[PDB]
Design an enzyme around this catalytic site. Sequence first.
Site, short mmCIF file in Angstrom:
data_model
loop_
_atom_site.label_atom_id
_atom_site.label_comp_id
_atom_site.label_asym_id
_atom_site.label_seq_id
_atom_site.Cartn_x
_atom_site.Cartn_y
_atom_site.Cartn_z
N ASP A 1 26.19 8.14 -25.70
CA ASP A 1 25.66 7.03 -26.50
C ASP A 1 24.64 7.82 -27.53
O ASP A 1 24.74 7.46 -28.64
CB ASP A 1 24.86 6.30 -25.75
CG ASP A 1 25.90 5.21 -25.05
OD1 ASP A 1 27.15 5.07 -25.45
OD2 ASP A 1 25.49 4.34 -24.38
N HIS B 1 32.85 8.80 -29.67
CA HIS B 1 32.26 7.94 -28.76
C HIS B 1 33.18 7.80 -27.63
O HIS B 1 33.11 7.85 -26.48
CB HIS B 1 31.67 7.05 -29.78
CG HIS B 1 30.88 5.88 -29.07
ND1 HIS B 1 30.92 4.62 -29.76
CD2 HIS B 1 30.41 5.81 -28.04
CE1 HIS B 1 30.38 3.74 -28.87
NE2 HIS B 1 30.12 4.30 -27.87
#
Lengths: 121, 121
Positions: free
Chosen positions: A89, A47
């Site tokens: 995300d 991420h």
Amino acid sequence: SLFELGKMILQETGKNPAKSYGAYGCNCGVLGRGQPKDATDRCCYVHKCCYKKLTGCDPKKDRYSYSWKDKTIVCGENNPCLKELCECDKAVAICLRENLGTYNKKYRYHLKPFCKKADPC
Amino acid sequence: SLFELGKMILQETGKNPAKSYGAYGCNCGVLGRGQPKDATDRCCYVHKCCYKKLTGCDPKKDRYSYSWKDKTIVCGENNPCLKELCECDKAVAICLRENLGTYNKKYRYHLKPFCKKADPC
């Protein structure tokens, strides 16, 4: 922004996102990256590496549009930076959900200053 | 370090310190200061201003000696910086305990990027 990221996490995992992931391990939530503790933590490492390319926008603060359609996160079109952000995300929310089975509460509030340094993205 | 700080908070408040205070409001836990949300948050604002006055030691990482004596936090002599650091941490633990009556769980996992800027210490 953190608002969308949180909502995605909740939608996928069914868990309070800041509680479970706001401070987990060496990579989830606040601050930067660190040597990962486990698969959940690695999701967050991925991420934050995904975020690196997004120099034209702000992963923490910038809002963007997505919808929850047939129990899938669907990123709305926006500018390229916000679209990519949304996809970073989406991917972490899916990954965290996929790794719930090895989620370890001992890492929930990990003392991040003592983490070992992450490999470069 | 965070170890002694959390142990003090636990001894005073009786609460899991990182759960209740690792990310509370605009000032408790990670990152810097921000406009305080309430009295608990202000304890942490004061805490972080206290840390600015230290002279070379590291409030996150540096260990120091203290004891719990007759249900009082007693800072060991340590060295000058560590002693002052210990007193910063003792003060915030006491303050957080004193303000348990207005502790608001809605601030527990406050999204700190959206906090308004703190006044100078």
